[PDB]
Subunit: 357 residues, 3 copies
C-alpha cells in the first residue's frame, strides 16, 4: 500500500483538560487502539488532556511537534507516543503509530453526550404509514410524516421534524430541533447538529416585467454515508433533480448549500461557507471558513480554498486558492485601498515611463 499524508495534520490541536466520572485502566484504553503499554497497564485513567495541561490521572498524547519540548515535563499519567518518542521516556508510554488518531478514537470513551434508549416518546407524532425501526429512538414532540423511514439504531432528538417520504439510514444521529423537508434521502451514520434545515426551497425565481415569479423546487436531497452537518446549516432541495452530498462529507456550522449543488466524497467545509446553486465540488477538497462559491462552476479533486475567498470560476488544477487582501492597521489599509483604485492609472503611467526611458 502507498503511504498517505495530509497537510491538515499541521494544524495546532486545541489545548485542554477533561476530568471524567468514568474510569478505564490504561490496559483497557490501550486495547481499544492497539497500543503497546510500556509501563504499568493497571493505572486507572479518569480523563484526557494535552501535555502541559494533563495531571497524573489523565492520558495525554503528542500531536504537534511544537509541544514535543514539553513531553518530559508533562504530569500526565501516561502518554500516547510514537516508538521514537517513547524511547527514553521516563513515564508510561502507550506506543502507537499515530497518537492523535488514537486520541480521536479514545475521546469517545469519555463522551458525556446523552444516549437515548430505543423507543418512541409518547408525545411524538408518527404517521401510520411511516416506518420507525424498533431499535430507533424518537424524542419528545418529534413529528415523523407520511412514508418516512427511520432506520435501525437511529436517534431522533426532541422537536425534530422528519418530512414526508424522507429516509434516515442505520446508525444516524439527529440532535434536537433538526428539520428535514419531504423527499430527503440520507444514508448511514449521519450526524446532524441542532437547527440544521435539510431540503428547504432555495431561491428559485424568474424575473417577469420586474416581478419575481416562483419556480417550484420539485427535486429532493440525497446525502451519502458518514456525513456530518453542523448547527444551523442549511441544504436546499433541488429544482428538478436532487441536491447531492457524497460519502464522508463533513460540513461545519452555519453553512449554506444551495439547490443542485454536488459535493464529492470526503470533502470538508468549514463554518460559514456558502455554495451557490449548481456548483460541483470534487473529492478530498477543503473549503476554509467563510469561503463562497459562485454558481455553476466545478472544482476538481484535491483543492483547498483559504478563508473568506470568493471563488469565481471553475478550478481544474489541484492546489490552494485565495482571494482578498492582507490585514493591516486600518489607517494603513485605507492608503492601500486608495492606491488599488489608482492601479489602472498607475499601470498606464508605468508603461509611459518605460517608453520614455
Amino acid at each position: 500500500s502507498s503511504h498517505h499524508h495530509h497537510h491538515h495534520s499541521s494544524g495546532l490541536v486545541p489545548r485542554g483538560s477533561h476530568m471524567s466520572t468514568l474510569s478505564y485502566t490504561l490496559g483497557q484504553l490501550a486495547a481499544h487502539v492497539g497500543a503497546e503499554v510500556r509501563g504499568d497497564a493497571d493505572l486507572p485513567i479518569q480523563g484526557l488532556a494535552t501535555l502541559q495541561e494533563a495531571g497524573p490521572a489523565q492520558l495525554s498524547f503528542l500531536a504537534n511537534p511544537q509541544y514535543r519540548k514539553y513531553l518530559p515535563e508533562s504530569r500526565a499519567g501516561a502518554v500516547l507516543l510514537t516508538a521514537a518518542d517513547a524511547d527514553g521516556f521516563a513515564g508510561t508510554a502507550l506506543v502507537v503509530a499515530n497518537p492523535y488518531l488514537a486520541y480521536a478514537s479514545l475521546s469517545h470513551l469519555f463522551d458525556r453526550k446523552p444516549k437515548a434508549a430505543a423507543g418512541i416518546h409518547p408525545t411524538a407524532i408518527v404517521a401510520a404509514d411511516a416506518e420507525v425501526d424498533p431499535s430507533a429512538s424518537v424524542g419528545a414532540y418529534a413529528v415523523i410524516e407520511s412514508g418516512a423511514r427511520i432506520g435501525a439504531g437511529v436517534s431522533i432528538g426532541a422537536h425534530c421534524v422528519i418530512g414526508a417520504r424522507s429516509v434516515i439510514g442505520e446508525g444516524g444521529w439527529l440532535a434536537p430541533r433538526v428539520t428535514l423537508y419531504h423527499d430527503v434521502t440520507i444514508g448511514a451514520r449521519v450526524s446532524i447538529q441542532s437547527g440544521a434545515v435539510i431540503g428547504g426551497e432555495g431561491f428559485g425565481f424568474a424575473n417577469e416585467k420586474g416581478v419575481w415569479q416562483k419556480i417550484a423546487q420539485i427535486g429532493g436531497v440525497t446525502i451519502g454515508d458518514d456525513v456530518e452537518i453542523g448547527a444551523n446549516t442549511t441544504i436546499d432541495r433541488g429544482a428538478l433533480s436532487d441536491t447531492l452530498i457524497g460519502n464522508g462529507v463533513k460540513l461545519d456550522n452555519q453553512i449554506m448549500i444551495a439547490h443542485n449543488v454536488q459535493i464529492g466524497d470526503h470533502t470538508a467545509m468549514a463554518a460559514c461557507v456558502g455554495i451557490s446553486g449548481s456548483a460541483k465540488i470534487g473529492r478530498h477538497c477543503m473549503l476554509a471558513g467563510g469561503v463562497g462559491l459562485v454558481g455553476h462552476i466545478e472544482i476538481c479533486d484535491n483543492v483547498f480554498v483559504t478563508g473568506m475567498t470568493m471563488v469565481t470560476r471553475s478550478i481544474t488544477e489541484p492546489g490552494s486558492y485565495s482571494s482578498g487582501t492582507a490585514m493591516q492597521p486600518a489607517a494603513e489599509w485605507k492608503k492601500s485601498a486608495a492606491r488599488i483604485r489608482q492601479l489602472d492609472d498607475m499601470a498606464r503611467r508605468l508603461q509611459q515611463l518605460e517608453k520614455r526611458l
Copy 2:
C-alpha cells in the same frame, strides 16, 4: 406598453429531471400557460426535465441559448419553445412567448410538497384572543399567542411560534419551525422557510464606561405582500419604528436583516447577505451571495452588487458594484497581497521617477 428585459435571464438554468406519479396531458399543461400545441395534445406527461436530461414522458423547455444546439437531439416528449425555435422542430412543440416562464408556472403542477387541510391540530396552543381563520391550517405543537391574527388560507407548520399581536395575511405559508416575535405584521402570500426568525431583538447597546447598556427594541416588523424568506434567515424588529420589507421582496437563506433596515419592492437578496442597521435599499435591486452593507446608507433603485462585496457607502447611480480581489493560486495571491501593502510606497516612487524623467 414598453418592452421589458432583465439581465438575470442570462443565468444558467439548473439541469435536471423529475419523474412524477402525477400525470397531465400536453393539452392540460398547454392550457395552463396559454401554449399552442404543435402536435398531439393527448400525450400524457409524467414529469419535467431540461433538454439533454429529458425522456419521452417528460415536457422540456429551451431557456439558455447555450443549449439550443441540443434541441434536435432531446428525447423529451414535447418542448416549450418560442415560435422561432418551433419552426422546423421535428417533435411536439408547445409554443409560448417565454419557455422558462411557462416552465416556472408548470413546475407547481408537479410539486410534491405537503398541503395541509384546514383546521387546528389538537396539540396546537391558540390563545383565546388570537383569531385563526377557519380556512387556515395550524400544525402540531404550534403556539399562537394573544392577539395574533392568522388569515384565510394560511398554512402554519408544526412547531411554529406566532408572537403576540402578530399578523399573517391571506394565503401565507410558513414551513415548520418558523418563529415570529410579537408585533410582526405580514401581508398576503408570504412564504417562509424553516428556521427563520422574524422580529428578534438585534444588537442595541450603548457604551457606558466600557460596559454595554441594553436599549429596548420596541418597534416591530412590517412585511409586504408576496415576500419570500429563506431558511434560517433573521429579520430584527425596529428600535422605535418598524423594520420594513416591501412587496415582492425575495430573500434567500441565512440572510441577516438588522434593525430598522428598509427594503424596497421587488428587491432580491441571495444567501448569506448581511444588512446592517438602518440601511435602506431601493426597488428592483439585487444583492449577490454574501454581500454585506454597512449601516445608515442608502442604495438607489436598479443596483446590483456582486458576490461577497462590502458596501461601505450610499449608492446614488444605478449599476453594478463590486469589492474584493480576483481569486489566484495561493502562492500567487500571497505575492499580490504583499505588493498591495507596498502600494503607497510604490506610488510615491512612481511619482519621484516621473519627476526625474
Copy 3:
C-alpha cells in the same frame, strides 16, 4: 475617577417613533433616570421618538450632533438634553448628563415584550432530577433534561431544549426555540434570542488516509454574566476544556463561535462574525459585521476590526484593523482586480526602471 469616552458614541442613532398604550408622567420618567425637569412634570408621555419624528405626547432626546440643528423645531412633548442644550430651549427639557443613556434606560418602560408569570407549562417536560426555581417560567413544549438547573427569575421560552446538567443563572431570558446541549453553564442575566444553539459539536476531525475521523467533543461551554446572544447564533462546545465567553459580552445575530474560543469581558461582535477554533479575543474589543478570525490566534484588549475583514494573525497592539478593497462600480473594479494580479510584475518593472534612471 478618570473620564471615559468611546468612539462607538459617534454612530448614528436610528430614527423612529413609538406610540404606546402605556403612559407615564414626565416626572415619573425623570425620576427613573435622575433628570431635572425644566418645565411641567405633570405632562403624560405615551411614547418615545427621535427629534424630527416626535410628536407632543412623546419624549425625545438629542444623541447625535448632526441633529442638534433640528432641536428648536422638534414637536416633542419634552426632550432629554445636556445642561448646555437645555439653556435657551423653548420647551420642557429633562436635563441629564447623557441623553442617549437616559433614553436607553427609559426604552424598557415602554417595551411590549411578553412577560411570563412564574410556573411550568403543563406541556413542559422536566426531568425529575432537574431543578427549576419556583420563580422561573418554563413555556409550552420546553424540555428540561436531567440535572439541569434553572435559576430564580429565569424565563424559558416555548420549545426550548435545556440539555443535561446545563445551568442558567438568575434573571436569564431565553426566547422561544433556544437549544442548549449538555454541560452548558451560563451565569446571571443572560439574554438569548430565538434559534441560538449553544454547545453543539463543531468540526472535530482528523484525516486518516483521506477519510475524516470524528473526535468526540467532550468539553462544554462556560458563559459569564450579562451576556447577549443573537438570533440563530451558534457557540460550539469545547474539545476537552470549555469554550469560554466572558462577562458583558454582546453577540449579535448569526454569529459562529467555534470550539475552544475564548472571548474576554465586554467585547462586542456584530452580526455574521465567524471565529475559528481556539481564537482568543481580549476585553473591550469590537468586531464589525461579517468579520472572520482564523484559528489559534490572540487579539489583545481594545481592538476594533472593520466589516468583512479576514483576521489572519495575532494582534498585539490596540487599534483598528481592516482587509479587503474599496467598493467600485463593477467595470472599474474589474480593471483594479486585473492590475492587482499584475502587481508582482509591476513591482519588478518599477525596480528595473529605478536602476535605469
